Structure formats: structure tokens, C-alpha cells
Design a protein around this nucleic acid. Sequence first.
RNA 1: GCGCACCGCGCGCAGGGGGGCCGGCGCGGCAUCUGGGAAGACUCCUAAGGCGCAAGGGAAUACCCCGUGCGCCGGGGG
Length: 54
Amino acid sequence: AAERNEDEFYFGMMSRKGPGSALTRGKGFTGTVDGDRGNKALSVETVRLLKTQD
RNA sequence: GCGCACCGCGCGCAGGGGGGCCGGCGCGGCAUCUGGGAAGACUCCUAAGGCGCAAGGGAAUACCCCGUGCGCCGGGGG
């Protein structure tokens, strides 16, 4: 954290959401980067399929 | 009709059959009036925007709140 480069660029930054700050995260601030549970916003046709099943 | 005063009524109670059919309650209609809901698509349809589903974040942690992907309607213009 001391010897980091402020103008650094990685291409995972275009596909990840950073740790933020206490002001952009607020009470839900830990110092970490969130990960993916594999959940997704599912479209309306396939939810119609899943609710005919239900 | 028994017990209580065999110098008395009435009383504690078992309950027959009908009565005053007095009022409440129950059920049935009730031309209207009253209230609520539904309601006509000219009407009302919450606004120039809203709604739904699925994910994401936060909690008064039963409720609720905020703005990503899919859709559904709408206003305006046309």
C-alpha cells in the first residue's frame, strides 16, 4: 500500500468493482473487493419458463 | 300436590295443560331512504411518468428503502 503506483492500469478494472471508500460505500464499507455469487438478472422469457415449472 | 302453623295465610319445590300471545331474539320478504363495495369506458385510470420480473446494496431485520438486465404500458412529438 505504501509502494503502490497510483496511475496503474489493469484490464480487470473494466470488469470488477473496486473497494471504494467510506463515503462511496458508507456503512457497508469493508476494505475488500466484492466477488460474484454467480447470480444474475434473469430475463423475462426464461422466468416465464421457470414459473410454468413452479 | 308434599313438608313447614291441625290456634292461620303464604312459603321451599316436582312439574301437567293451555293463557296475557308484553318485549327481546331468530328467520322471511321490504315501494323507498342511508352507508359501503362494485360500476358505465365520455366519466376514474393518482403523472409526465408509472408498473412487472430478476439480480445488486442498506436497514426500523416480518414491514420497508435506493439506482442494473430484461419486458409491459403511458405522456410529448409525430
